[PDB]
Amino acid sequence: ANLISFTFKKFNETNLILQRDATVSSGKLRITKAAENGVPTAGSLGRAFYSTPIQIWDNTTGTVASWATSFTFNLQAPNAASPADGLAFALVPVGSQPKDKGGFLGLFDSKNYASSNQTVAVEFDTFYNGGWDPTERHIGIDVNSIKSIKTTSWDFANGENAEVLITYDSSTNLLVASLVHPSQKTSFIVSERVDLTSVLPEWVSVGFSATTGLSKGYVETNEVLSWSFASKLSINKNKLAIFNLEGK
Amino acid sequence: ANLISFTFKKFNETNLILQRDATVSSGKLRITKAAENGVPTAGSLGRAFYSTPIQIWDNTTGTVASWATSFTFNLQAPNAASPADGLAFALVPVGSQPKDKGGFLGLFDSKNYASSNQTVAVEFDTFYNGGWDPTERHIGIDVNSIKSIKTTSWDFANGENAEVLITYDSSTNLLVASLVHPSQKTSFIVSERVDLTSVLPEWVSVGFSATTGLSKGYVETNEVLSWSFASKLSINKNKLAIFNLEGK
Amino acid sequence: ANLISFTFKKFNETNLILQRDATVSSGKLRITKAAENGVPTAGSLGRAFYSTPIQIWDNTTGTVASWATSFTFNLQAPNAASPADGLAFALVPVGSQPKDKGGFLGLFDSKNYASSNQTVAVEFDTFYNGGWDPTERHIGIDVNSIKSIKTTSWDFANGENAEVLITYDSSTNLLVASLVHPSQKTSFIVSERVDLTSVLPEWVSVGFSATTGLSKGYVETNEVLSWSFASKLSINKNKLAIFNLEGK
Amino acid sequence: ANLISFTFKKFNETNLILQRDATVSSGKLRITKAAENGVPTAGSLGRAFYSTPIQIWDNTTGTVASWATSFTFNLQAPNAASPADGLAFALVPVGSQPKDKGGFLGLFDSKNYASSNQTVAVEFDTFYNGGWDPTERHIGIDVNSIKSIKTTSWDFANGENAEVLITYDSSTNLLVASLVHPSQKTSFIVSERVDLTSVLPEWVSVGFSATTGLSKGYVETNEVLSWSFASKLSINKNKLAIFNLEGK
Numbered sequence: 007a008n009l010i011s012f013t014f015k016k017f018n019e020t021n022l023i024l025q026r027d028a029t030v031s032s033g034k035l036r037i038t039k040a041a042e043n044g045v046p047t048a049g050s051l052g053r054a055f056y057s058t059p060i061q062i063w064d065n066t067t068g069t070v071a072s073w074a075t076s077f078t079f080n081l082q083a084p085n086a087a088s089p090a091d092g093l094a095f096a097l098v099p100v101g102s103q104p105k106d107k108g109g110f111l112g113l114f115d116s117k118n119y120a121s122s123n124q125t126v127a128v129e130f131d132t133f134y135n136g137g138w139d140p141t142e143r144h145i146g147i148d149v150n151s152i153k154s155i156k157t158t159s160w161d162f163a164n165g166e167n168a169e170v171l172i173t174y175d176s177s178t179n180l181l182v183a184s185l186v187h188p189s190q191k192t193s194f195i196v197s198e199r200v201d202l203t204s205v206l207p208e209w210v211s212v213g214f215s216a217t218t219g220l221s222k223g224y225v226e227t228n229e230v231l232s233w234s235f236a237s238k239l240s241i242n243k244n245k246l247a248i249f250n251l252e253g254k
Numbered sequence: 255a256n257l258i259s260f261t262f263k264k265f266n267e268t269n270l271i272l273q274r275d276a277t278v279s280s281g282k283l284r285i286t287k288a289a290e291n292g293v294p295t296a297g298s299l300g301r302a303f304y305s306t307p308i309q310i311w312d313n314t315t316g317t318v319a320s321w322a323t324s325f326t327f328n329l330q331a332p333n334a335a336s337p338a339d340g341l342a343f344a345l346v347p348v349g350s351q352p353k354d355k356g357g358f359l360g361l362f363d364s365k366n367y368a369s370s371n372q373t374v375a376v377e378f379d380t381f382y383n384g385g386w387d388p389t390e391r392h393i394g395i396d397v398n399s400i401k402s403i404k405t406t407s408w409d410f411a412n413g414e415n416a417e418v419l420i421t422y423d424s425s426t427n428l429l430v431a432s433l434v435h436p437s438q439k440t441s442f443i444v445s446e447r448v449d450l451t452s453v454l455p456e457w458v459s460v461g462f463s464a465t466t467g468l469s470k471g472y473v474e475t476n477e478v479l480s481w482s483f484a485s486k487l488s489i490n491k492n493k494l495a496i497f498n499l500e501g502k
Numbered sequence: 503a504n505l506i507s508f509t510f511k512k513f514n515e516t517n518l519i520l521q522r523d524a525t526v527s528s529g530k531l532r533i534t535k536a537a538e539n540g541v542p543t544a545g546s547l548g549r550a551f552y553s554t555p556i557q558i559w560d561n562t563t564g565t566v567a568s569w570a571t572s573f574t575f576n577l578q579a580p581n582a583a584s585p586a587d588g589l590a591f592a593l594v595p596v597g598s599q600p601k602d603k604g605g606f607l608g609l610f611d612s613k614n615y616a617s618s619n620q621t622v623a624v625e626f627d628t629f630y631n632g633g634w635d636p637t638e639r640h641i642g643i644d645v646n647s648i649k650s651i652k653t654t655s656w657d658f659a660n661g662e663n664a665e666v667l668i669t670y671d672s673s674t675n676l677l678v679a680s681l682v683h684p685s686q687k688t689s690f691i692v693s694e695r696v697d698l699t700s701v702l703p704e705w706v707s708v709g710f711s712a713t714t715g716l717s718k719g720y721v722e723t724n725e726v727l728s729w730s731f732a733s734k735l736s737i738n739k740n741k742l743a744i745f746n747l748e749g750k
Numbered sequence: 751a752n753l754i755s756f757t758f759k760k761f762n763e764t765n766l767i768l769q770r771d772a773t774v775s776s777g778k779l780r781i782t783k784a785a786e787n788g789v790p791t792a793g794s795l796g797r798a799f800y801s802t803p804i805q806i807w808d809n810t811t812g813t814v815a816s817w818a819t820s821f822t823f824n825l826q827a828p829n830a831a832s833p834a835d836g837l838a839f840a841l842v843p844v845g846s847q848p849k850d851k852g853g854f855l856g857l858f859d860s861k862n863y864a865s866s867n868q869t870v871a872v873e874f875d876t877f878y879n880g881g882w883d884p885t886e887r888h889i890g891i892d893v894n895s896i897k898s899i900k901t902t903s904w905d906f907a908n909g910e911n912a913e914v915l916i917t918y919d920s921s922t923n924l925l926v927a928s929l930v931h932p933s934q935k936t937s938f939i940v941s942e943r944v945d946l947t948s949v950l951p952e953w954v955s956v957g958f959s960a961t962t963g964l965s966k967g968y969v970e971t972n973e974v975l976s977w978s979f980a981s982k983l984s985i986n987k988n989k990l991a992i993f994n995l996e997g998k
């Protein structure tokens with residue numbers, strides 16, 4: 007069985023693929039733009055992916071990878087009544103480029119299903135886009151669309167660390183995503199069946215995408231403090247307890 | 255840093271401490287009694303712990319272990335309208351013996367706080383005991399009492415696998431417990447601050463406790479299909495993504 | 503696949519089976535007796551095993567475990583021209599008791615093959631017993647006999663740390679043992695085919711055995727500073743890179 | 751602490767940086783050219799490195815990474831009396847290009863110390879270059895020169911798998927390299943102190959380099975069957991047991 011894993015407790019440019027406004031500052035992955043004084047700027051889009059492609063499924067053998075990722079993020083809004091747009095963990099084709107900003111989170115073009123995007127994302131959505139969104143802040147699973155196939159309520163705590171765990175089990179095709187705000191003692195969970203052989207190419211880049219608002223005042227930070235990933239592809243035909251010790 | 259981990263995809267008597275009705279049958283940990291025909295029996299109590307003690311905190315250094323556990327369980331009731339009582343993952347003192355059966359799950363004596371029990375448990379409670387329980391099936395965190403310090407709703411699916419992840423972070427003192435029913439695509443999550451140095455002895459046995467009803471007809475299986483554990487104790491002063499690959 | 507591992511950077515009585523003179527002092531596993539002033543005593547025998555049994559092979563499936571262990575030891579002799587006897591890493595039957603002291607290292611009765619001992623050991627032999635030993639200090643593989651089936655020269659550095667790696671590959675039946683003296687930049691290696699299904703019971707205790715001389719003046723310490731173990735048993739049919747990081 | 755690891759039981763172009771003749775064929779990394787009939791060709795040079803750079807030391811904190819790698823290789827010569835030249839595991843600067851072929855193994859220019867190459871390599875040298883080589887087949891440690899700073903005898907078994915383990919301990923600055931031929935039950939070991947902060951840049955590519963002879967008839971395969979790597983960089987201040995299970 008082929009294995010790949012990593013743990014970034016601090017970040018570095020050298021092992022990341024940085025796109026647009028995404029930047030490493032003082033060991034922190036700052037996906038969207040912040041001023042020298044620490045003011046988040048509007049109209050920002052940023053992306054970061056790991057420098058090594060991950061084989062998510064094998065066409066010749068029919069094997070599917072089981073994988074898990076954990077990260078700690080922090081969305082900090084100067085004014086909570088007006089922030090946007092959110093951040094997401096995504097699997098994209100290898101040389102994949104950013105798409106629409108704002109509510110599309112740098113990952114999608116529109117609300118309708120476009121299979122040629124070949125993108126799976128778990129979004130953490132700070133802004134009510136209504137054109138497609140549920141009423142409150144939510145975690146969603148995005149398959150080739152910004153219009154999540156399933157969501158769950160997220161009691162987002164402004165400027166407070168969120169510790170995320172996303173797991174994919176090959177044998178049940180189940181994608182699970184959970185968020186914890188340790189300072190609030192709150193927790194949230196989403197689970198949906200996703201067939202990755204239907205959605206993603208055999209090889210993907212894993213990482214993050216985030217945006218700020220399309221208006222001057224709708225601003226927030228989209229920072230990632232730590233990140234851990236592990237994947238296991240069987241040859242023919244994920245120890246999770248040991249994995250979250252690495253990251254969250 | 256001292257480390258300990260294991261993964262049981264199948265079970266064996268030889269590395270377990272079996273108490274009361276708990277038994278290994280065909281590689282499955284059957285905590286409570288089942289007939290030769292496969293009929294769950296009432297009035298049953300069973301416990302299983304790992305044969306090696308886990309240091310959960312160090313008095314001399316002040317260090318606290320971070321740990322994670324994942325398991326898959328299956329509660330199967332012939333009649334869903336009348337089952338009891340549930341199963342729990344517990345940390346108990348090393349030579350610890352079973353307590354009250356039924357709604358006390360083999361772990362506690364009463365509803366009031368008794369610190370000398372020194373027991374932390376995450377319960378999966380199939381039965382409304384009301385004397386202390388919420389109205390529906392629930393996951394709860396038990397600290398020296400059967401009366402959980404916090405609960406969350408559990409849409410229990412009869413005879414369907416439940417994949418559980420329990421994590422404890424030393425730095426935030428946060429115990430998180432999540433349950434997934436992959437066949438239903440449902441998921442549930444509980445999080446509460448627990449100071450283990452206040453609750454548990456330095457050394458504990460980790461494992462499971464379960465009971466059937468205190469009436470002839472209130473019967474269910476309490477089976478554990480797989481189990482994974484990992485713990486990390488720093489010397490002075492948990493990679494989770496890699497851990498759940500091991501178990502769930 | 504069933505997994506078991508641990509890493510002791512410091513030692514504790516609570517997760518060990520201590521036999522005879524073996525003792526934990528200031529986080530160090532002291533296999534043989536030392537005075538309050540730090541003087542090693544003669545005629546000493548000591549043993550330490552992990553509290554959880556390891557399944558080394560499965561009779562019903564025919565599967566054999568692959569395993570690896572790493573430890574750092576220190577043999578300190580007041581007078582190098584007169585020390586004895588050495589220390590060994592051993593796999594013994596579960597409730598196994600010490601045997602002959604001195605040159606037999608607490609593991610064997612005699613030089614002739616006795617299959618009922620069911621013991622595999624990698625010895626680090628400080629003393630020329632001649633009755634069976636090579637001329638100089640040696641690493642040997644012991645199968646049911648103190649008379650090694652294969653040895654290699656060991657340029658033992660008195661009172662200097664030795665970092666050991668022992669690996670067993672199920673698919674090649676190859677036991678490899680290596681010793682490094684980092685302060686000397688020296689290294690030594692032994693490899694021999696051993697069929698464990700022929701030698702060991704299905705379940706074993708893993709750990710250490712050591713002895714001091716059978717004369718007043720032939721004295722040394724037999725200390726173990728750190729210890730790491732991992733084993734993997736397939737269900738029906740070892741990552742050494744990551745192992746020795748955690749390991750050594 | 752930042753972590754990185756992988757295990758290739760089979761190979762893929764997508765996560766490798768392939769240079770010159772190096773190619774992936776049927777899941778095997780074939781470093782040097784082979785004909786369609788399976789005939790090794792002369793005058794070949796090939797290199798393969800992992801697509802993610804490894805931080806081997808940190809200038810700002812003074813921290814040095816501990817790392818380990820394990821691989822299985824196979825050198826197959828049609829005529830043993832005339833093969834060349836060998837293969838090596840190397841750490842090179844990130845965008846580093848191949849150097850001289852033949853006896854220089856694609857890694858070096860000459861025998862004299864050139865610090866600007868910034869290359870550490872463990873060589874497995876099939877050919878007596880005399881200009882710098884010991885008389886028989888050898889494992890050597892190469893620091894900025896093809897003239898090894900230390901070697902050891904290698905009883906090379908033609909067309910037989912060699913299982914290699916290379917470890918670097920930050921605290922002792924010790925590089926250890928061992929080779930096992932499981933079919934022969936033979937083993938070999940080399941150890942030397944290397945200060946990596948003196949030799950390598952902070953970031954390196956890890957991987958392999960190999961060459962065939964500079965004469966028509968001096969031909970061999972230089973195949974790598976599996977490969978595992980793990981590295982650990984502390985923030986301010988390696989479990990080998992578990993590593994070599996996943997590893998080898």
Ligand SMILES: OC[C@H]1O[C@@H](O)[C@H](O)[C@@H](O)[C@H]1O
Binds near residue numbers: 091110133220
């Ligand atoms: O005002 C901020 C908002 O502006 C909308 O036009 C946009 O679609 C939203 O995603 C959000 O950015």
Ligand SMILES: OC[C@H]1O[C@@H](O)[C@H](O)[C@@H](O)[C@H]1O
Binds near residue numbers: 358
């Ligand atoms: O009838 C079944 C029930 O009986 C009650 O007396 C008991 O307290 C419950 O835990 C449950 O077992």
Ligand SMILES: OC[C@H]1O[C@@H](O)[C@H](O)[C@@H](O)[C@H]1O
Binds near residue numbers: 587604606715716717
């Ligand atoms: O005096 C030292 C020696 O004494 C021998 O009789 C004994 O067999 C050796 O193992 C060694 O201990």
Ligand SMILES: OC[C@H]1O[C@@H](O)[C@H](O)[C@@H](O)[C@H]1O
Binds near residue numbers: 834877963968
């Ligand atoms: O002919 C075989 C040999 O030829 C030499 O000139 C060369 O330096 C050696 O590396 C080897 O390839």
Ligand SMILES: [Ca+2]
Binds near residue numbers: 109134139
């Ligand atoms: Ca939105």
Ligand SMILES: [Ca+2]
Binds near residue numbers: 357382383
């Ligand atoms: Ca109850």
Ligand SMILES: [Ca+2]
Binds near residue numbers: 605635
């Ligand atoms: Ca001897």
Ligand SMILES: [Ca+2]
Binds near residue numbers: 875876877878879
């Ligand atoms: Ca040469």
Ligand SMILES: [Mn+2]
Binds near residue numbers: 138
């Ligand atoms: Mn949304």
Ligand SMILES: [Mn+2]
Binds near residue numbers: 402
């Ligand atoms: Mn309850």
Ligand SMILES: [Mn+2]
Binds near residue numbers: 627640642
């Ligand atoms: Mn001997």
Ligand SMILES: [Mn+2]
Binds near residue numbers: 884
């Ligand atoms: Mn050479």
